[PDB]
Design an enzyme around this catalytic site. Structure first.
Site, mmCIF file in Angstrom:
data_model
loop_
_atom_site.group_PDB
_atom_site.id
_atom_site.type_symbol
_atom_site.label_atom_id
_atom_site.label_comp_id
_atom_site.label_asym_id
_atom_site.label_seq_id
_atom_site.Cartn_x
_atom_site.Cartn_y
_atom_site.Cartn_z
ATOM 1 N N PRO A 1 -0.256 2.358 5.606
ATOM 2 C CA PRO A 1 -1.198 3.001 6.550
ATOM 3 C C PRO A 1 -2.017 1.988 7.343
ATOM 4 C CG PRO A 1 -2.106 3.155 4.390
ATOM 5 C CD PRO A 1 -0.648 2.674 4.220
ATOM 6 N N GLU A 2 -2.310 2.329 8.594
ATOM 7 C CA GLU A 2 -3.104 1.468 9.463
ATOM 8 C C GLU A 2 -4.480 2.127 9.617
ATOM 9 O OE1 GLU A 2 -0.693 0.167 12.948
ATOM 10 O OE2 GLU A 2 1.070 0.733 11.772
ATOM 11 N N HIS A 92 4.672 6.443 -10.829
ATOM 12 C CA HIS A 92 4.088 5.322 -10.094
ATOM 13 C C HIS A 92 2.557 5.325 -9.985
ATOM 14 C CE1 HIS A 92 8.192 4.276 -9.131
ATOM 15 N NE2 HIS A 92 8.386 5.468 -8.596
ATOM 16 N N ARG A 111 5.560 0.460 -4.513
ATOM 17 C CA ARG A 111 5.905 -0.959 -4.416
ATOM 18 C C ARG A 111 4.942 -1.912 -5.145
ATOM 19 N NH1 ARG A 111 7.938 -2.386 1.622
ATOM 20 N NH2 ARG A 111 8.980 -4.025 0.394
#
Ligand code: ZN
Length: 259
Positions: A1-2, A92, A111
DNA sequence: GTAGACCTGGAC
DNA sequence: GTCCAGTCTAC
């Protein structure tokens, strides 16, 4: 996300946790904890503190507690959610904050790239990673003058300049490619080659793009001109959008509209 | 500036 | 099976 996505998270998450008191902190992937280095110390210091606020600086979320501030970066795939502590965790999930009312704040990251730092409130802005960040794009602090100062000093690509969080904070791969298209500038050209007129135009489009994205709750995907549209016709001239590698990352642009 | 690191799973 | 998706590092 930005920036747009993180700002959307900040606004939606705040009412779901404000006023709650931390009872326990459980960590399943220690590497995410950057400071204090010892995850046991990280967990112990937050117990007993209440959530008072939630702000954003660049791409970082800043959880404001009683004495401390928790600085969190989601990197590529981090996400937060609030739910009942009585239900099984989703896959996760690497860090969980348990509240005294039986609910919990969960952090998931497939990740495992995300980071977390905890400092006393007054030290947060003077220590890494927040210390060296550039100005907020939607503030008077970001102006053409500021962009030119860094631009007329380096020969690296303009895209590499825009991705540098020390120049300005908040832009990532999507919004840099979109801003450059809207300003009519090729992503691979030297930052020092841009004229004063091109700089003013770039600044204007950067502010407009990021501002509009926030209002739409982030990717706004229906409003993309080039990101992920390789092979498709340009919405403005019909020329096929192309994709290459600039600054070590996927780059999208129109060879006719951008020069 | 140009691949690799850290890590995992989806599309082709 | 192989390519693709925010920062830091070493040649
Ligand atoms: Zn075009």
């Amino acid at each position: 996300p930005e920036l747009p996505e993180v700002e959307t998270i900040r606004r939606t998450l705040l009412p779901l946790i404000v006023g709650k008191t931390i009872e326990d902190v459980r960590i399943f992937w220690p590497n995410i904890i950057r400071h204090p280095r010892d995850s046991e110390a990280f967990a112990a210091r937050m117990i007993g503190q209440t959530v008072r606020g939630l702000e954003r600086r660049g791409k970082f979320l800043k959880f404001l507690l009683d004495r401390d501030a928790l600085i969190s970066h989601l990197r590529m795939e981090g996400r937060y959610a609030v739910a009942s502590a009585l239900e099984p965790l989703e896959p996760h999930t690497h860090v969980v904050f348990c509240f005294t009312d039986g609910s919990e704040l969960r952090y998931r990251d497939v990740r495992k790239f995300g980071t977390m730092h905890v400092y006393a409130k007054e030290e947060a802005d003077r220590r890494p990673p927040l210390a060296e960040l550039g100005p907020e794009p939607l503030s008077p602090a970001f102006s053409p003058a500021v962009l030119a100062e860094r631009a007329v000093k380096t020969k690296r690509s303009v895209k590499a300049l825009l991705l540098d969080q020390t120049v300005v904070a908040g832009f990532g791969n999507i919004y840099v490619d979109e801003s450059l298209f809207r300003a009519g500038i090729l992503p691979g050209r030297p930052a020092a080659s841009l004229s004063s007129k091109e700089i003013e135009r770039l600044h204007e489009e950067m502010v407009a793009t990021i501002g509009e994205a926030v209002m739409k709750g982030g990717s706004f995907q229906h409003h993309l001109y080039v990101y992920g549209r390789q092979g498709n016709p340009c919405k403005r001239c019909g020329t096929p959008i192309e994709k290459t590698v600039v600054a070590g990352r996927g780059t999208h642009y129109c060879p006719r509209c951008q020069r």
